[PDB]
Design a binder for these strands. Structure first.
Lengths: 52, 214, 252, 233
RNA sequence: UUUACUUAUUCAAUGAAGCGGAGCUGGAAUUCAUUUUCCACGUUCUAGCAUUCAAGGUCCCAUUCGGGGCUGAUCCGGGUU
C-alpha cells in the first residue's frame, strides 16, 4: 500500500480511504439531519422554561 | 430464678392529629434488666382499634384504625396513620344474596416520599313502587363506576401525606360524590373504602416528622 | 489405589479455556461518575457469537467521555436487540429492555441479567444462556434489593447493584436433544475435556474408588458426606433426598 | 469584539470531554507516602496514651519566638572558629606563657541528649527545653516526667533541628542553658516563670490526659447525620 | 450480657474520575414570621459527529509577530473505592 500516490491509491474524497462512501451517504443525511433537528430540539427548551 | 414480669415495662399508646382523645390504653413491653430493652432495636408494632370508642359515636360504630410506632419522648410515644383494616362481620353483613358486588383496585403516592394503597367496594339498591325482588346489572354499568372512584382519590391524597388523605375519608366526601354522579341513570348505595393500608415510609429525619404534630 | 480424573484435573494443564479465536470475556462498563449519577448514549457495535459458548454476546462499545475515544466493552445476550440499538447505560436512564442501571433505582418483578452482588463488577450472576432473574422485594432502608435466581435463591443485594433488563438470548437450547454425540464433541472443541465420562464400576480398584469386582458394582453406598476426603469424593454428596427430585438443595 | 462569537459546551454527566480537573484528592499513591501520612493519621484514629497525648499538644508560637531570638548569638565555634580557639591559647600560653585559664569558660546554649539528661539529675542546668519529635516515640519518652520529679523546666517546642543548626549539629532534641550573660540575665529569669505556668504546673491536670479517638472528615460529617440528626435539628 | 464507628486484620475493583458534607439555582410540604425542609442538577424518536490551557466573560502585557491564569464545570477538607 505505502508505495503509491494519493491520486492512485485512495481518492481525494471524504473518508475515501476508511469506509466505502455508500454506507457513508446514509451518514451525512443521518448526521446533518439530526444537527438541524438538534437546534430545532434545543430552542424549544429555551421557551418551555421561559414562561415560568 | 426467672420472674420475667418484673422485667416488662409498661408503655402508653397515643393517637394521631386527625383523630380525637389521644389517651387510648395502658399495655406492657420490656424494661432493660438482663441486657435487652424496647427502643431503636425493632419497632415492628402497630395498633388495631375502632375509631368509634376513640371518638364518641354509636350510630357510626365501624372502621378499625391501623397505626405505626414513631418516636418516644420520656414514656410518651406517638403514632402515625399506616393502615385502616376492617372486621369480617362488616363485609359479610353488607354482602347478601340476589344483589351485585364490585372490587376496585387503585395506587396513590404523596410528596414526602411516602406510599400507600386504597380499595373501594360498591353495592346496589331498589326504586319507587318496586314489584320484583331481583334484577342484575348489564356490564356497561360496572366498567364506568370503577374508573370514577379511582380518579377523585388519586388527585386528593398527593401532598402533605396522610394529613389530606384522612381530611376527606372521615367526613365522607367520596361516598356522596360517586353516589350523586352516576345517580343521573343508575345510583348504587354504600360504596366505601373497606380495606386500606400504607407500607412504604421515607426514612427518619425529625424535620419532616414535625410538620404533622399537635 | 492409584489417582482419579477429577483429582488429576485439579492441578491443571489442558483443562484450560479453548479461546485464541474468541472475541473477548464478559465485562461491561464498571460503575463510575455519570454511571451512579446520570447515564450515557450507548451504541451497540454488533451481536457476534463467542467462539466456545451457547448464547451470543452484545459487544456494546462506549463513547469515552474523557476525549474522542471509543473502547468496545462487553455485555451478554438480550432477547431481541438489533445492530445500532441506542442501549443507554445509567442510574438515571429509564427502564427499557437491554438498557442497564441499579435494581433499587427500578421496580419489583423486573427481569434483568448479568446481575452482580457489587455495582461495577462488570459481571456476576444471571449470565447463563436463556435464563433470567426477578426482583421480589424493595427495602429502601440500607439499599437492599431482594432478587430471585433460576433454582430459587433470596439473595438481597444493593439498590445501586448493576442489572440490565431482559433475558439471555438462547432459550430452548437444552429443550432440544442433540442426538449425535458428535456435535457434543463439536461443542467441547472450544470449551474443555470434561467429556466423555465413564463408570467407576468399569475401572480397577487402584484406577478409581468404586473400582474392582468381576461382577460390577460400587461397593459402599453411593451417598457421601457433603465434605468427604479428596480421595473418597465420587457419588451422592449430601442426598437428604434421592429419587423423585423437587429441586430442593440447601433448604426449600 | 469584531469577530468574537462564542457557543455553549455541556460537561454535565454522560456526555462531553472532562478537561483539566484537580485530581489532587484521588491520585495514584506509592507505598512511601501511603504509610508516613496514614502514620500520623493512625495516631489520631486510636486514643493517645496518658504518657503521650502531649505530642501534637504544645507551647505557643510567640513565647518560643524569644526562646530562639537570643539563642542565635549562642552558636558554638564552627570548624573555622573552633580552630581559632586553638590559635588563641597557642599565641598566649607560648607568647606570654598562660596557665590554661587564658580564654574565658563557655557561655553558649547547651547540646546533648545523654548529657542534658545528666544535667537534670544533677539539676546543674538553669533552663531545659524538650522536642515533640524523634521517630522512636518510646526512645525519648522520659524527658518530661524526669524534669517534673526533679523540678527542672521543660517547654515542648516544634524544632529539634534549630536546636542543632545554631550548635554546629543537625539534631539535638535538648536545648538547655545552665549559664547566662552580663546583660541577658533578664532572659533567664523571665523564661523560668513563663515556661513554669506553660507545662510544669499544667501536668497537675494533664495528670490523666487522654487523646485521639478522632475519624476523618468523612466519618465525622456522616457521624453528624446519624447521631446528630437523632435529636438535634 | 448487647450493637457502633473505624484504623488492625480481610474482599472486590480502576490506567486510585467523582468521596463526606455543604452550597450556588429551581422545584417540591409551606411558614406561628423567616429560610420551619425533601429531591434533581444540560445528554431517551434514529448502527452518526464528540479530542490541541475548550470558547466566551475579565485583567496585567508596555502592545507583538503572541502569552497567563480565575470562573466556565460550586466550594471547603486530603480518608482511591
Amino acid at each position: 500500500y505505502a508505495t503509491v500516490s494519493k491520486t492512485h491509491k485512495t481518492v481525494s474524497r471524504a473518508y475515501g480511504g476508511s469506509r466505502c462512501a455508500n454506507c457513508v451517504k446514509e451518514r451525512i443525511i443521518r448526521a446533518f439531519l439530526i444537527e438541524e433537528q438538534k437546534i430545532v430540539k434545543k430552542v424549544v427548551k429555551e421557551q418551555t422554561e421561559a414562561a415560568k | 430464678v426467672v420472674d420475667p414480669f418484673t422485667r416488662k415495662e409498661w408503655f402508653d399508646i397515643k393517637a394521631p392529629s386527625t383523630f380525637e382523645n389521644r389517651n387510648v390504653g395502658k399495655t406492657l413491653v420490656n424494661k432493660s434488666t438482663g441486657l435487652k430493652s424496647a427502643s431503636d432495636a425493632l419497632k415492628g408494632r402497630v395498633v388495631e382499634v375502632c375509631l368509634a370508642d376513640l371518638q364518641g359515636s354509636e350510630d357510626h360504630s365501624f372502621r378499625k384504625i391501623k397505626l405505626r410506632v414513631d418516636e418516644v419522648q420520656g414514656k410518651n410515644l406517638l403514632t402515625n396513620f399506616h393502615g385502616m383494616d376492617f372486621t369480617t362481620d362488616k363485609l359479610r353483613s353488607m354482602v347478601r344474596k340476589w344483589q351485585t358486588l364490585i372490587e376496585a383496585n387503585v395506587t396513590v403516592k404523596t410528596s414526602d416520599d411516602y406510599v400507600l394503597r386504597i380499595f373501594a367496594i360498591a353495592f346496589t339498591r331498589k326504586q319507587a313502587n318496586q314489584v320484583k325482588r331481583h334484577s342484575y346489572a348489564q356490564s356497561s354499568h360496572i366498567r364506568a363506576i370503577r374508573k370514577v372512584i379511582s380518579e377523585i382519590l388519586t388527585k386528593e391524597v398527593q401532598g402533605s401525606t396522610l394529613a389530606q388523605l384522612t381530611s376527606k375519608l372521615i367526613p365522607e366526601v367520596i361516598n356522596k360524590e360517586i353516589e350523586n354522579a352516576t345517580k343521573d341513570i343508575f345510583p348504587l348505595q354504600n360504596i366505601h373504602v373497606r380495606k386500606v393500608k400504607l407500607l412504604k415510609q421515607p426514612k427518619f429525619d425529625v424535620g419532616a416528622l414535625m410538620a404533622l404534630h399537635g | 489405589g492409584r489417582v482419579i480424573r477429577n483429582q488429576r484435573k485439579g492441578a491443571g494443564s489442558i483443562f484450560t479455556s479453548h479461546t485464541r479465536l474468541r472475541q473477548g470475556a464478559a465485562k461491561l462498563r464498571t460503575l463510575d461518575y455519570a454511571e451512579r449519577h446520570g447515564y450515557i448514549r450507548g451504541i451497540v457495535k454488533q451481536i457476534v457469537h463467542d467462539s466456545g459458548r451457547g448464547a451470543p454476546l452484545a459487544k456494546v462499545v462506549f463513547r469515552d467521555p474523557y476525549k474522542y475515544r471509543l473502547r468496545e466493552e462487553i455485555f451478554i445476550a438480550n432477547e431481541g436487540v438489533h445492530t445500532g440499538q441506542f442501549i443507554y447505560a445509567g442510574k438515571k436512564a429509564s427502564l427499557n429492555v437491554g438498557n442497564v442501571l441499579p435494581l433499587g433505582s427500578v421496580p419489583e418483578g423486573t427481569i434483568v441479567s448479568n446481575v452482580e452482588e457489587k455495582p461495577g463488577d462488570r459481571g456476576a450472576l444471571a449470565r447463563a444462556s436463556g435464563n433470567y432473574v426477578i426482583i421480589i422485594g424493595h427495602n429502601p432502608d440500607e439499599n437492599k434489593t431482594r432478587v430471585r435466581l433460576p433454582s430459587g435463591a433470596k439473595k438481597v443485594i444493593s439498590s445501586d447493584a448493576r442489572g440490565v433488563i431482559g433475558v439471555i438470548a438462547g432459550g430452548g437450547r437444552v429443550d432440544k436433544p442433540l442426538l449425535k454425540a458428535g456435535r457434543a464433541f463439536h461443542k467441547y472443541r472450544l470449551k474443555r475435556n470434561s467429556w466423555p465420562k465413564t463408570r467407576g464400576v468399569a475401572m480397577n480398584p487402584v484406577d478409581h474408588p468404586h473400582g474392582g469386582g468381576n461382577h460390577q458394582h460400587i461397593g459402599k453406598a453411593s451417598t457421601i458426606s457433603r465434605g468427604a476426603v479428596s480421595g473418597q469424593k465420587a457419588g451422592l454428596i449430601a442426598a437428604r433426598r434421592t429419587g423423585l427430585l423437587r429441586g430442593s438443595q440447601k433448604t426449600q | 469584539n469584531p469577530l468574537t462569537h462564542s457557543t455553549p459546551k455541556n460537561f454535565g454527566i454522560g456526555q462531553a470531554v472532562q478537561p483539566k480537573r484537580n485530581l489532587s484528592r484521588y491520585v495514584k499513591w506509592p507505598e512511601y507516602v501511603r504509610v508516613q501520612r496514614q502514620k500520623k493519621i493512625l495516631s489520631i484514629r486510636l486514643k493517645v496514651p496518658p504518657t503521650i497525648a502531649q505530642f501534637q499538644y504544645t507551647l505557643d508560637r510567640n513565647t518560643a519566638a524569644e526562646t530562639f531570638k537570643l539563642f542565635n548569638k549562642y552558636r558554638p565555634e564552627t570548624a573555622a572558629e573552633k580552630k581559632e580557639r586553638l590559635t588563641k591559647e597557642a599565641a598566649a600560653v607560648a607568647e606570654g606563657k598562660s596557665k590554661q585559664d587564658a580564654s574565658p569558660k563557655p557561655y553558649a546554649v547547651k547540646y546533648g541528649l545523654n548529657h542534658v539528661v545528666a544535667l537534670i539529675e544533677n539539676k546543674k542546668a538553669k533552663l531545659v527545653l524538650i522536642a515533640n519529635d524523634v521517630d522512636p516515640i518510646e526512645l525519648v519518652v522520659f524527658l518530661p516526667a524526669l524534669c517534673k520529679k526533679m523540678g527542672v523546666p521543660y517547654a515542648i517546642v516544634k524544632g529539634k533541628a534549630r536546636l542543632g543548626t545554631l550548635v554546629n549539629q543537625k539534631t539535638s532534641a535538648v536545648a538547655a542553658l545552665t549559664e547566662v550573660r552580663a546583660e541577658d540575665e533578664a532572659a533567664l529569669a523571665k523564661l523560668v516563670s513563663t515556661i513554669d505556668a506553660n507545662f510544669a504546673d499544667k501536668y497537675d491536670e494533664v495528670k490523666k490526659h487522654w487523646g485521639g479517638g478522632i475519624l476523618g472528615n468523612k466519618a465525622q460529617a456522616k457521624m453528624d447525620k446519624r447521631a446528630k440528626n437523632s435529636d438535634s435539628a
